[model samples]
Target: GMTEYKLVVVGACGVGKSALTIQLIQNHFVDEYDPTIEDSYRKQVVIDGETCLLDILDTAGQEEYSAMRDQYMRTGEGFLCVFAINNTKSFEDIHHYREQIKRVKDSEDVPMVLVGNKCDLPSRTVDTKQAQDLARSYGIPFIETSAKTRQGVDDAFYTLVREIRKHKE
Candidate 1:
């Protein structure tokens, strides 16, 4: 039997949320920063030897899109909460995304992956240990990724799918 899941990519502006999504779906990195309101992508993936369809929603992280966040969170079965390792403020806002998802979903055990993006950058302000510690506190998986380099991009999404499947079971 095949399964379908809704996943949302979320983070502060310019944290590479859309970049990560695009990289996974299209296998191309977007260099220009174009703010997104909401975009959806559909892809089929195999996890645990089972084929699954993923309906991914890439959400805008700007405050103007705050009004639509609850709707996105409500529909998503899983979430990829992203932050750029080069930006400390983006890392700080990760809790807000997690809290919003929990508030909207009304579940403390929401399936989510804490992603530290832009790992390819040398001038990173948020270290892996700090991000890992935060994920540990939240009891979620943390992955460092570089959408530009295509490193760990698939792992982040695949990990979230695994988490979603675990929740379903």
Candidate 2:
């Protein structure tokens, strides 16, 4: 039997959402990102001997796809909130997505994780100081991922699913 994991990837512009999800499903990387309005990418894998069907939806970070966010967020079982290490402003924008998550969910009992993406890129303006606070603040599980080089890619997706499984039970 397969349990469905409705995972949503939320982040601001230029944070590499498309690349991460694309790499996971296609086993290849997409260097350039468009509004990335593709339908949910479906991939199947077994985590901890349990079959999981990951239905991942990536946000485009624009109002053009605004109408879909609410519906998807409602359906989403977990969120992989991402921010680029180089784009400190992208890090700030995570609150935007999390803010919307609150307004919609109406409760703090939700499965979520933070991803500091683009780790392979040099020159990080993202404050490690706050990143430590990031984990301690809400106590969210956090990890750094370099989607280009495929570093921490499996762990990032797998970590979220484990959270979702815990959420289900």
Top model number, lDDT: 1
lDDT of 1 at 66: 60
Which residue pairs come into collision in candidate 1? Answer: none
The alpha-carbon lDDT assigned to residue 55 of candidate 1 equals: 85
Cα lDDT of candidate 1 equals 0.88
Shift of residue 121 alpha carbon in model 2, Å = 1.0
Clashing residue pairs in all predictions, respectively, total: 0, 0
Best by TM-score: 1
- What is the C-alpha RMSD, rounded to one decimal, of candidate 1? 2.1
Q: Which residue pairs does candidate 2 place in steric collision? A: none
